[model samples]
Target: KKLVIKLSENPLVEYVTEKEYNEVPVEEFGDALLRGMGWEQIHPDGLGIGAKFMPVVK
Candidate 1:
């Protein structure tokens, strides 16, 4: 059986490629992707005004 995954958006939360996954480390990929998706990664410790660091959402 062959399983195929497709991403319908530039910044998607459903499907991703190995290259993309590799580009963004799993440890800090979700937040980074979210930021890439224009979700804004705010500092959890409450420090900066805009997105500074990425946070794992899983």
Candidate 2:
């Protein structure tokens, strides 16, 4: 009869998973993003006095 056993130590067992991303509806989503921070207006409220945003007739 014979028996053998071995053990090893390791720092990292596996590599992290990488993901693919297809991004942005920014022209649509961006409007909401900036408005949240009041960036849509650049200056403070009532400062620009109806500034750069004019809607297109699309």
Candidate 3:
């Protein structure tokens, strides 16, 4: 019901609420998050195209 995004060697992180995860599309999730972080112009290259969850939670 929750989502988390963490960056290595950077303090930037993001948390997604259950409502947001339900509403946001997975394909555009990264884009929406980047935009939320004020990174609008940059494209989310690695996070796109065949991006799938593999149950690798730590």
Candidate 4:
């Protein structure tokens, strides 16, 4: 399935991958997505914070 951003009360930011649904923390999840999309951020941890996110279709 194609990438889609899941905004729910449970996880908030759900990032699904080709392998499987990667359940990550909302804070890192959102940050990861932004960082992955070339959006720079002040990640105190490291550059490993990134993920492929998508927009929700209504």
* Ranked candidates (TM-score, high to low): 3, 4, 1, 2
Which residue pairs does candidate 1 place in steric collision?
none
lDDT of 3: 0.59
What is the model-wide C-alpha lDDT for candidate 2? 0.44
lDDT of 4 by residue, 1-58 (tens): 2233444335354765654534554555666665545556666664574843569886
Model 1 lDDT per residue over 1-58, tens place: 2222333475546877788966556656445545544654445885656554679887
Cα lDDT for residue 43, candidate 2: 80
Residue 3 of model 4 has an lDDT of: 36
Write down the RMSD of all candidates, one decimal each: 20.0, 22.5, 21.2, 25.4
For each candidate, what is the lDDT? 0.55, 0.44, 0.59, 0.52
Which tens-of-lDDT digit does each residue in 1-58 have in candidate 3? 3434434435543886788866766866676555545664455776765555789888
Candidate 4 least-lDDT 10 residues: 1-10
Candidate 4 ranges with C-alpha deviation above 4 Å:
1-23, 41-58
Sort the candidates on lDDT, descending order: 3, 1, 4, 2
After superposition of all CA atoms, the RMSD between model 4 and the true structure is 25.4
Residues 3-50, candidate 2: write the lDDT tens digits: 222234247847533331123333544454555445532686665667
| Clash count, predicted structure 4 | 2
By lDDT, the best candidate is 3
